[PDB]
Amino acid sequence: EVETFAFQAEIAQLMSLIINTFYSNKEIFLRELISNSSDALDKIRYESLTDPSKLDSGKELHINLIPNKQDRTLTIVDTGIGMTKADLINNLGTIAKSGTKAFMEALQAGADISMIGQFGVGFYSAYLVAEKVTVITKHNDDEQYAWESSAGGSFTVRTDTGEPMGRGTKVILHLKEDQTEYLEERRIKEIVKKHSQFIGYPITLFVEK
Ligand SMILES: N#Cc1cccc(-n2cccn2)c1
Known about the structure:
This protein has a single domain (3-205), classed as 2-Layer Sandwich (Heat Shock Protein 90), CATH 3.30.565.10. It contains 4 helices and 8 strands. The chain has helices spanning 9-20, 28-50, 85-107, 185-195; strands at residues 3-6, 63-68, 73-78, 130-138, 144-149, 154-159, 168-175, 203-205.
C-alpha cells in the first residue's frame, strides 16, 4: 500500500533548482548526507544517556558507504535515531519550508549551492547526483518505512517489508547515468577525506566485488 504526497510548492521549487541549475561542484552531496547521519547519531547517543534502553535496537553507532555498480546505487547507512512517519510526511518539510526561503534569499544575495546545509535542506542536494532517492528508516517509536521520490513534485511513503534495520536510516541514491564516478572507491575516499575528515563516528567505505 503506497501513499503518494505532493511536496510543498516551495520544496518542489528547491528541487527543480537543484536539478536544473548548472553547478559542477556536485560532490558536496556526500558531505551533506554524512553530516545528516552524524546529527542523527548524535541524537540517539544523547537520548541513550538518560534512557539506556533506546539502544536495545542496536548499540553500534556508525556510518557505512555502500556503492553498487550493477544497481548503479550509492547507499549511505547510519544507525542514528531514524525518522517517524510524521517526520517523513510533515515535520521535516515544515522545517524545510523556512530554511528553503532563507536559502533562496542567500542564493540571490551571492551565496552558492554548497552552502545549502546551513539552511537545514542539505538532504535535497542528493538530487545533484541521483535521479531517484529511496530512504529506508526505522525510529524506535514507529515502524520501518520507505520514502521515495524522483522529484517532479511528489514523493511516496510505504511501510517497508524488506530486511529489518533495527534503527537508523538508509539513503539509496539511484545515480544519474553521468554521475557514476561516485561509485568509484578512490573518488569516494577523496571526497570523505576532503569534506568529512572529522566526523566523530566510524565511516566504513565498502568495496565491491
Ligand atoms: N534521509 C532523509 C529524508 C527523507 C525524507 C525527507 C527528508 N527531508 C525533508 C526535509 C529535509 N530532509 C530527509
